[PDB]
């Protein structure tokens, strides 16, 4: 007979037919999936008096355990079974209530922001309800639905109650970002932004995905703080960190200005780095989990040798600060010294006036001052062989994988900012953000500047051709620019940065997939002109949108500090060597746009940045950022069992993909990163990768490490992020 | 280890058919000329064509000058030094003859009682007793020791084979059976506490734990209130967690559901309760403690074993002829074999208990296009084990008519007209709907009238050596792989699962099973008909779980599943490695 304990708490006959129907509904249009198989694997687990919720968990998981390269459609079967379970959990039935009725109930429960009701009439919620297509829920993969349930959908943190479904999330996120638009155009903007995100064309980051529509205003997830060489500045930096990490922001810290140990910071940089570490970790569940930072400093700093080994897990405690990452800052002269097999001189910033500034802004001024101070022998200085310094850095980079590189000259010669007024002097956590900053005297110093950036991404696998990006760029820019006016700022210097420059970082996901379906690869140069073609379209259409927005709503307060303001474009300042590796011509009117920018300026000082995505791209079953996948199936752990994801359209494209370890070397990929950087305002989170088994005795030669470093330099690469080493 | 040979020169004196014919001859020697040789011919045929599988001691002994054939003994210890010593002496005696031991030592009072020093020193003693005849002190002589989950000293006892403690805290070379009932499990579900008493401080409590569940219910709650009584209180989840943890890592902390062993049993638990098992967890017989090695008031349980080869029979009515042969061959042996301890002779002549089981079940399911894990083999298992138990009962019934029932027959639930088909766990109705094909109602009456020669007939034991003889899959277990590898000084020995050629796809190899549910249901359906118990295993492949760690949630759930389907005992837990 088999009995089932219902939602409330009373038995009832088991209903095998209803279960079969739900499965049959779920399987519609899927290929290579056996309902029968899923039925057998779950029915055996049932027992007399089974809770109704656990039957759904059993069928979902049963379908999830069959996800494979051969039968990838189990991704969607399990997903739909989970959507079906979430509907019954949220609304007591499959059918979502009417939008207005739901919003009203939720605001009343304190779960949605009450301004939704103020800003929109009931008739306006009726109209918006007509934009909604709840069946779009059927288009999520299993891993996507796990993400929605884990960290997106408005839920009760303690009871585990889910209150909404994915389309309500999408419509309302549209509503809040366009709330202040004139009735004339408001709802049309809402409809088209909803469409773009619910059909995966635009990818939105976590803080926006889980927050916008709720009572919170905490959306800043990356901050850049520059430290001056004083205790007051040190403390201000520390306090700013603590503030932002309690809101979960990732930190980039420029601490290169702090004077070396032994100066007229008698005790040196490291105690202060430890302090920044504890600041970063001050809100972490145990002191490891949560809160992350990358700290930046010049390669020529007197204390550099001590600093390079800071995360070497085999030293002494007061010599080590292991739980931050580091960005070593380099320029043309340092590299030249390497090639010429010469020496590098190490100065404390304090003993070399004008030297630190020139290092970022003026390369030949740096050239002059450096050689001058190398002669002047009253100045405290250390001399080292260039090969031993680069060797040490690359060694530390190789074993931890998190000693990063920033080419400061490239960040300033090819930049949307005039390095004389607003130089770029650091990056963020993941190495794609490149914005100006100024040190603080006090946590509340209205003279300091903390850089912030709002992020999003275009899904290169959801668009059919490149002129779709016009409509999408308009939506992305205007949605994110509105957010800048919507979100809280807990530290005045950060509000300065954001309202002064209005900087955005809009990037890509699903690039590997994109190259695959165009019959191109990473490693051979076959994707060069297509990358050039693709990223030209991206940057041109982003600039156009921010330009139309400047015409509509006025340029950004500090616009006059951009190289854009002076009529200069990215197509003018890019590394010249890119001409030797791609010959795609420009397809868009960069000259009309130059003038239209000279005239009306830009709403935003930056627009583009290529960030890693991991959680975000799971939502739309996309390959992460611009990275090639490691394998066809991606495995993740969760207390709900093993979660699998199959790279998009594996069925038709398995041979088209170039999986990460199939690449003979880094050259192909570094060229694509170069070609991309031609158009990117900020930077790109590029990786270097090495399989020991491609090298004699399984040891990666330093020669190859140094060569690839110089290759990235050669093609105008601004930053180098992770180094991955294959193991096994 | 079978053929009569010179142990020292390595001379072989006989061949396999002489072994088979003569084993037939000795077991039917006392039969009347009228029928004697016909019995010999048909028993020879049955064993030489692998239909009946015989255990090692019989296979190597019967026809030789020896009379040592008992390979499993069950001894219960009372709470006194005299009983402790008697138990120890009985062990030493049987292990010098190579018997496997099951010891019930749960009655010994806890450390700190009015066994001031406690159970463990005495467990060490039983260990040394068990190992007293072992080539180095590891090789040979094995035991499982049984105790209640609610014993005051339980937390100390659960970790006894944890190889990372201190010496006087550890007794590593015995296995353990933790004894549980409905109330303990309920406490787990309800997320409540379990109270730990020493047996000595709770009169009538230990007895009820096996015989009367609602009497146990009353006394337990009573003594939980009475706060003059020495008692320890623990969270039910932490106790079960500890047990399952110890079970997971050693693989040899066992489970016995004492209520199931008594509500569904061929014995009246008021007169002769089942209170322990043997080494491998399939034997379930009554026992009584001894005052002295020679105490004619004690009872040591013994059981003679054999098996039907489910791969050598073409259909299920062949079992009639085979059951007759098996029962009569083994019942004669009971009268043929020596008994070195009087309490054991009591058990065997009083109850005449047999344990006849199966081999080649995986193979059997394979050739019927059935599998273990999906429920596809449920009605076939029901069909197969009904045939087995009905035909065994019929043979022992015809034998009772011919030679008189067993002296203590009146203590069986059989004597009262009650059958296994009356007392089985009710939840088995929700997972199989095969109807009964045999006249259980005619048999009820024919049993009410003439009784049974033997108080028990069926038990599902592991076989390893035995099934090798007839190239059979071991017992009711699915094989690990198609080829089984064994070492010997003669080189690598290989065995290929029967009819691999035609059936490789039909098999469900052990690690191909998504979980334990399918197999536990088949063990349940089997237990419906089995007199005693079954050596069932639980199995887990770490790589089917996140981070390769087996969740306690799943361990506890499967434990409760076995309980739900009337599983009496849980034996090995195997973990895949690599």
């Amino acid at each position: 007979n088999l009995l089932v304990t219902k939602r409330d708490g009373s038995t009832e006959r088991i209903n095998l037919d209803k279960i079969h129907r739900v499965l049959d509904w779920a399987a519609e249009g899927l290929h290579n999936v056996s309902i029968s198989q899923v039925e057998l694997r779950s029915h055996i687990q049932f027992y007399d008096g089974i809770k109704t919720s656990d039957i759904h968990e059993t069928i979902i998981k049963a379908a999830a355990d069959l996800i494979s390269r051969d039968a990838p459609d189990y991704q969607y079967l399990a997903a739909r079974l989970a959507i079906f379970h979430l509907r019954k959990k949220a609304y007591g039935q499959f059918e979502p209530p009417a939008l207005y009725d739901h919003v009203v109930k939720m605001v009343e429960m304190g779960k949605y922001d009450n301004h939704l009701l103020e800003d929109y009439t009931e008739e306006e919620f009726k109209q918006m309800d007509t934009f909604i297509d709840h069946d779009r829920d059927m288009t999520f993969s299993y891993a996507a639905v796990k993400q929605l349930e884990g960290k997106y959908l408005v839920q009760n943190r303690v009871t585990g109650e889910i209150y909404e479904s994915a389309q309500f999330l999408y419509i309302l996120v549209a509503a809040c970002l366009f709330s202040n638009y004139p009735r004339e155009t408001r709802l049309q903007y809402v409809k088209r932004f909803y469409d773009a995100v619910s059909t995966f064309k635009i990818s939105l980051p976590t803080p926006i995905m889980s927050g916008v529509r709720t009572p919170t205003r905490q959306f800043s997830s990356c901050v850049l703080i520059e430290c001056g060489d004083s205790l007051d500045s040190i403390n201000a930096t520390s306090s700013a960190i603590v503030k932002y990490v309690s809101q979960r922001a990732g930190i980039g810290i420029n601490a290169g200005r702090i004077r070396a140990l032994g100066s007229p910071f008698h005790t040196g940089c490291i105690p202060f780095y430890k302090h920044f570490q504890t600041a970063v970790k001050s809100c972490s569940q145990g002191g490891v989990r949560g809160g992350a930072a990358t700290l930046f400093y010049p390669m020529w700093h007197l204390e550099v040798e001590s600093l390079l080994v800071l995360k070497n897990n085999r030293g002494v405690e007061g010599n080590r600060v292991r739980h931050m990452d580091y960005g070593v800052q380099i320029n043309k002269l340092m590299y030249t010294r390497l090639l010429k097999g010469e020496d590098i001189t190490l100065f404390s910033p304090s003993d070399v006036p004008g030297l630190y500034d020139a290092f970022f802004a003026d390369q030949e001024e740096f050239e002059r001052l450096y050689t001058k101070y190398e002669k002047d022998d009253s100045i405290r200085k250390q001399r080292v062989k260039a090969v031993e310094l680069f060797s040490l850095m690359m060694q530390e980079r190789a074993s931890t994988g998190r000693i990063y590189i920033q080419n400061v000259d490239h960040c300033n010669t090819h930049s949307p900012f005039d390095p004389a007024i607003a130089p770029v002097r650091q990056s963020n956590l993941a190495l794609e953000i490149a914005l100006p900053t100024k040190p603080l005297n006090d946590v509340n110093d209205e003279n300091g500047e903390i850089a912030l950036c709002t992020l999003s991404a275009f899904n290169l696998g959801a668009i059919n051709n490149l002129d779709e990006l016009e409509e999408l760029a308009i939506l992305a820019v205007r949605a994110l620019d509105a957010l800048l006016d919507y979100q809280d700022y807990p530290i005045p210097a950060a509000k300065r940065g954001a309202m002064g420059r209005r900087t955005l970082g809009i990037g890509v996901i699903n690039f590997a997939y994109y190259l695959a379906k165009h019959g191109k690869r990473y490693s051979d140069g076959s994707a060069n002109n297509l990358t050039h073609k693709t990223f030209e379209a991206i940057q041109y259409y982003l600039l156009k949108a921010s330009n139309e927005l400047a015409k509509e709503q006025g340029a950004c307060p500090w616009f006059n500090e951009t190289t854009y303001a002076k009529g200069i474009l990215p197509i003018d300042t890019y590394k010249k060597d890119l001409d030797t590796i791609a010959n795609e011509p420009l397809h868009y009117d960069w000259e009309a746009l130059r003038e239209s920018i000279k005239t009306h300026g830009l709403r935003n000082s930056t627009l583009s940045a290529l960030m890693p995505s991991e959680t975000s791209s799971q939502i739309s079953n996309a390959t992460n950022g611009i990275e090639p996948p490691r394998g066809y199936v991606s495995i993740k752990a969760s207390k709900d069992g093993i979660l699998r994801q199959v790279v998009p359209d594996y069925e038709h494209l398995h041979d088209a993909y170039e999986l990460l370890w199939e690449m003979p070397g880094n050259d192909g990929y570094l060229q694509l990163v170069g070609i991309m950087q031609k158009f990117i305002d900020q930077s790109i989170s590029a990786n270097t990768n090495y399989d020991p088994s491609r090298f004699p005795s399984g040891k990666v030669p330093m020669q190859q490490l140094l060569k690839d470093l110089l290759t990235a330099y050669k093609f105008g690469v601004k930053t180098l992020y992770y180094q991955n080493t294959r193991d096994g | 280890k079978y053929l009569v040979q010179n142990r020292v020169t390595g001379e072989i004196y006989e061949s396999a058919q002489f072994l088979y014919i003569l084993v037939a001859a000795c077991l039917f020697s006392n039969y009347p000329r009228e029928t004697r040789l016909q019995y010999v011919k048909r028993f020879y045929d049955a064993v030489s064509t692998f239909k009946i599988s015989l255990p090692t001691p019989i296979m190597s002994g019967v026809r030789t000058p020896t009379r040592q054939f008992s390979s499993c003994v069950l001894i219960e210890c009372g709470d006194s030094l005299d009983s402790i010593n008697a138990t120890s002496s009985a062990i030493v005696k049987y292990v010098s003859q190579r018997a496997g031991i099951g010891i019930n030592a749960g009655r010994i009072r806890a450390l700190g009682s009015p066994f001031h020093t406690g159970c463990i020193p005495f467990y060490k003693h039983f260990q040394t007793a068990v190992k007293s005849c072992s080539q180095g002190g590891v090789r040979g002589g094995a035991a499982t020791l049984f105790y209640p989950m609610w014993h005051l000293e339980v937390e100390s006892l659960l970790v006894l084979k944890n190889n990372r403690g201190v010496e006087g805290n550890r007794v590593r070379h015995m296995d353990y059976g933790v004894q549980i009932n409905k109330l303990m499990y309920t406490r787990l579900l309800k997320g409540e506490d379990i109270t730990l008493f020493s047996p000595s401080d709770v009169p009538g409590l230990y007895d009820a734990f096996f015989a009367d569940q609602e009497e146990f219910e009353r006394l337990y709650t009573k003594y939980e209130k009475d706060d003059s009584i020495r008692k320890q209180r623990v969270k039910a989840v932490e106790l079960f967690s500890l047990m399952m943890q110890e079970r997971a890592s050693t693989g040899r902390i066992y489970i016995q559901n004492v209520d199931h062993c008594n509500t569904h049993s061929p014995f009246d638990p008021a007169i002769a309760p089942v209170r322990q098992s043997n080494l491998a967890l399939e034997i379930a017989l009554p026992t009584k403690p001894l005052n002295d090695v020679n105490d004619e008031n004690g009872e040591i349980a013994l059981c003679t074993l054999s098996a039907f080869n489910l791969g050598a029979i073409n259909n299920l009515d062949e079992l009639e002829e085979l059951a007759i042969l098996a029962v009569r061959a083994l019942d004669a042996l009971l009268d043929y074999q020596d008994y070195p301890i009087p309490a054991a002779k009591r058990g065997a002549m009083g109850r005449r208990t047999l344990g006849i089981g199966v081999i080649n079940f995986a193979y059997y399911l394979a050739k019927h296009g059935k599998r273990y894990s999906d429920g596809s083999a449920n009605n076939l298992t029901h069909k197969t084990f009904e045939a087995i138990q009905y035909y065994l009962l019929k043979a022992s019934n015809e034998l009772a008519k011919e030679q008189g029932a067993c002296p203590w027959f009146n203590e069986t639930t059989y004597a009262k007209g009650i059958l296994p088909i009356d007392t089985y766990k009710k939840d088995l109705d929700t997972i199989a709907n095969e109807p009964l094909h045999y006249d259980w109602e005619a048999l009820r009456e024919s049993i009410k009238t003439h009784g049974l020669r033997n108080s028990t007939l069926s038990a599902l034991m592991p076989s390893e050596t035995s099934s090798q003889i007839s190239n059979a899959t071991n017992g009711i277990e699915p094989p690990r792989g198609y080829v089984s590898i064994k070492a010997s000084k003669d080189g690598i020995l290989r065995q290929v699962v029967p009819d691999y050629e035609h059936l490789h796809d039909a098999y469900e190899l052990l690690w191909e099973m998504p979980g334990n549910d399918g197999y536990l249901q088949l063990v349940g359906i089997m237990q419906k008909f089995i007199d005693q118990s079954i050596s069932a295993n639980t199995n887990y492949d770490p790589s089917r779980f996140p981070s390769g760690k087996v969740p306690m949630q799943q361990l506890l759930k499967d434990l409760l599943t076995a309980y739900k389907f009337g599983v009496k005992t849980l034996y090995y837990q195997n973990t895949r490695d690599g």
Binding site: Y47, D54 | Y185, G191, Q553, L556, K557, Y563
Partner: peptide, 11 residues
């Protein structure tokens, strides 16, 4: 271990 997840089970 989850006592709520267990507690549903009927023995």
């Amino acid at each position: 271990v989850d006592t709520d997840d267990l507690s549903n089970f009927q023995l």
